[PDB]
Write a structure and sequence with these properties.
The structure is a homodecamer.
Chain A: E1 13-14, E2 23-24, E3 32-35, E4 53-54
Protein name (chains A, B, C, D, E, F, G, H, I, J): Microtubule-associated protein tau
Subcellular location (chains A, B, C, D, E, F, G, H, I, J): Cytoplasm, Cytosol; Cell membrane; Cytoplasm, Cytoskeleton; Cell projection, Axon
Chain lengths: ~70, ~70, ~70, ~70, ~70, ~70, ~70, ~70, ~70, ~70
């Protein structure tokens, strides 16, 4: 068995941006309610229960390059 | 068995943007309600229950390059 | 067995944009309601229950290049 | 057995856009309601139950190139 | 068995941004409520219960490059 | 008074040239003579008097782009 | 009075040239003569009097971009 | 009075040149003569009198970009 | 009075040149003569009188970028 | 009076040059002669009188960037 694995990555990921300018995120307030009696969690549970998510994600360049190489035998 | 694996990636991912200008995200408030008695989670559960998601995702260049190489035998 | 795998990627993904200009996302508030008694989750459940999703996704260049190479024997 | 695999990708994906101009997304509020008693999920369930999806997806260049190479024996 | 693994990464991830300009994130206050009787957690539980998430994520360059190489026998 | 001045220039000025090849500029000699008695210069004079101009202007790409923006009140 | 001045220049000025090749500028000698008695210069005079100009201007890329922005009140 | 002056320059001025090759500038000798009695210079005089200008201006890339911004009140 | 002056310069001035090759500047000798009696200079005189200018200006990249910003009140 | 002056310079001035190669500047000798009786200089005189200028200006990269910012009141 002879294997060779020479992936040649080169990829430029360019993004210039001379300006972004003013931004405004001014919503109003809102309510949340959840009601139950009991529960039970098992084996890799993930659960957000009740939230108010206000975000302002502003990268001056936010290029997400991602990769996943993987071999197996 | 003789294998050769020479993927030659080169890809430019360019995105210039001289300006973005003003932006405004000004909604109003809204409510959420959930009601039950009980539950039970098992084996890789994922559950958001009740949320108010306000986002302002503004990359001055947000090019998502992604890849997935994979071999097996 | 002799295998050769020389994929030559080159692809430019260009997108210039001299300007975006003003943007406005000003909706009103709305309600959500869910009602039940019980539940039970098993084996890779994914469930959003109740949400108010406000988004402003503004990339000054948001080119999604994606790939998936894959071999097997 | 002799195999050769030399795909030569070159594809430009260009999209210039000198300007986008004003945009407005100003709807009103609406309600949602779901009602039941019980449930049960199994084996790769995916279920959004109740939502208010407001989006403003504005790429100054949003070219989605995608690929999928795949071999097998 | 002879294996060779010479991945040649080169990828530039550039994002210049001459300016970002003023930004404003001025929402109003909202409430959250959750009500139950009891619970029980087991085997890798993750659960946020009740939150008010205000964020202002502003990188002057926030390019997320990520990778994942992986072999196995 | 409200003025807005957003000229969006984009113009490519491309000129490839795979080769120019041999060139020869082999003229002969010539004479020049000027005769007078006196003179007098005033207020932004420009005067070449007597010259032998041999030039070989060979740009491998000599695209003259020029512009002139101008406002006034 | 409200003025805005956002000229968005982008212009590529490209000129590839794979080769120029041999060039020859081999003229002969020539004479020049000027004769007078007197003179007098005033107020921004410019005067070349007698010259033998041999030039070989060879840019491997000699693109002259030029601009002139100008305001006034 | 409110003024805004946001000129967004971006202009690439590219000029590749894989080769220039041989060049030859081999002219012959020439004479120059000027004759007068007297003179007098005043107020920003510029005067070359008698010259033999041999030049070989060879930039491997001689792109002259130039600009002139200017305001006034 | 409110003034804002945010010129965003970005301009690449690129000029690659893989090679220039042989160059030769082999002219012959020439004479110069000037004759007068007297003179007199005043108020910013500039005068070259008699010269033999042999130049070989060879930049491996001689891009002259120049600018001139200027305000006034 | 409120003034703001935020010029954002970014300009790359790149010039690669893999090689320049042989150069030769082998002219012959020439004479110069000037003749007069008297003179007199006043108020910022500049005068070269008689010269033999042999130059070999060879920068391996001779990009002249220049600027001139200037305000006044």
């Amino acid at each position: 068995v002879q294997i060779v694995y020479k992936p040649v990555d080169l990829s430029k990921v360019t993004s210039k941006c001379g300006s972004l300018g003013n931004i405004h995120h001014k919503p109003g307030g809102g309510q949340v309610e959840v009601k139950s009696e009991k529960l039970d969690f098992k084996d890799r549970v993930q659960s957000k229960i009740g939230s108010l998510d206000n975000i302002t994600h502003v990268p001056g360049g936010g290029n997400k390059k991602i990769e996943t190489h993987k071999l197996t035998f």
